């Protein structure tokens, strides 16, 4: 971990930016700028389809970016605020495990690799399904549960 | 095992609806409405060839949906009234283990995943062949032993 930067709003933290691979990824629904001036001045490319703003990491001075994988076997993953269960095509956590302002947090596998970025989720009763950004071997894809809200 | 999410659908109970994956499933041959108003109000899509009616599970109660798989290796499976033997591609139970009114009962594998839904069966001596709804990858199919009666 420790690759997480706060996105500062006029008066609060509204989410986080994560360093994954050679890119810094931020949810587009999060408003504000990155706390670290070196990333704040960095140009970003926005996509409403994937709800992402991504930019190339100044890796020459940013070698702490997390490792990542496209592999997503059924099992449990670590997402900072607790354990997240992956089953079928969805990531699931306890309903009180997450909340608005937590978006931008990565989901890690048991080898310490980043699997997905949390955008939000839907309250399904006992559990909440997460709206996440994932990638396959080629491209980024977006998984959104019905009724999911941005966090 | 303890995933008892079968829902009765009549004053005089005649089979059960089950929550599997993202869908509410019940036999099409059973009369009556689901006791749970949240499900009873749903529109159901009816197919006479599969003896099956389905509807999307409401988000607020989706956490209670069971897990499912298309994998059906030869071996033993469990259900509410006992064990189910899968042999020769067919599901078989001890005669008398089931009865009329048991339609809609899920069959679970050893991981707690649903593999099939019971519609009825046929009496072959000490053993009863089950008429079931099963899945292959992304398709629903039905198995009907000769002389099988609806439950």
């Amino acid at each position: 971990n420790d690759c997480i930067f706060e996105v500062k709003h006029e008066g609060k933290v509204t989410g986080y930016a994560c360093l994954v691979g050679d890119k810094v990824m931020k949810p587009a629904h999060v408003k504000g700028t990155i706390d670290n001036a070196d990333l704040a001045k960095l140009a970003f490319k926005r996509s409403s389809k994937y709800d992402l703003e991504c930019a190339q990491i100044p890796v020459h001075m940013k070698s702490d970016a997390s490792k990542f994988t496209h592999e997503k076997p059924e099992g449990y993953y670590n997402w900072h605020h607790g354990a997240v269960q992956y089953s079928g095509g969805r990531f699931t956590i306890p309903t009180g495990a997450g909340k608005p302002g937590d978006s931008g947090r990565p989901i890690f596998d048991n080898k310490g690799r980043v699997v997905a970025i949390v955008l939000g989720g839907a309250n399904e009763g006992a559990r909440t399904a997460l709206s996440v950004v994932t990638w396959n071997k080629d491209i980024v894809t977006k998984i959104t549960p019905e009724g999911a809200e941005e966090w | 095992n303890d995933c008892i999410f079968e829902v009765k659908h009549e004053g005089k109970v005649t089979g059960y609806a089950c929550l599997v994956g993202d869908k509410v499933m019940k036999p099409a041959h059973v009369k009556g409405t689901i006791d749970n108003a949240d499900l009873a109000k749903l529109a159901f899509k009816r197919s006479s060839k599969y003896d099956l009616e389905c509807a999307q599970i409401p988000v607020h109660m989706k956490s209670d949906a069971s897990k499912f798989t298309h994998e059906k290796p030869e071996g033993y499976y469990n259900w509410h009234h006992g064990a189910v033997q899968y042999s020769g591609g067919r599901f078989t139970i001890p005669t008398g283990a089931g009865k009329p009114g048991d339609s809609g009962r899920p069959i679970f594998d050893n991981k707690g995943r649903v593999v099939a839904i019971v519609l009825g069966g046929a009496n072959e001596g000490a053993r009863t062949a089950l008429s079931v709804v099963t899945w292959n990858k992304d398709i629903v199919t039905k198995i009907t032993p000769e002389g099988a009666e609806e439950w």
């Binding site: - | 060839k49 398709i139 199919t141 039905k142």
Partner: protein
């Protein structure tokens, strides 16, 4: 009249062409829709 009656079978060539074009237009749409339904029924029949 020095001639006989016309009858319903005798229509102008231009009008006949229009009738065949319109009849064929609808008949073709039906034939296509019929083929689609037949294909779906055959596939639905084949699968079990």
């Amino acid at each position: 009249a020095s001639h006989t009656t016309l009858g319903v079978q005798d229509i102008s060539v231009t009008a006949m062409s229009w009738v065949q074009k319109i009849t064929g237009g609808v008949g073709l749409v039906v034939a296509v829709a019929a083929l689609i339904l037949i294909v779906v029924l055959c596939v639905s029949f084949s699968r079990h």
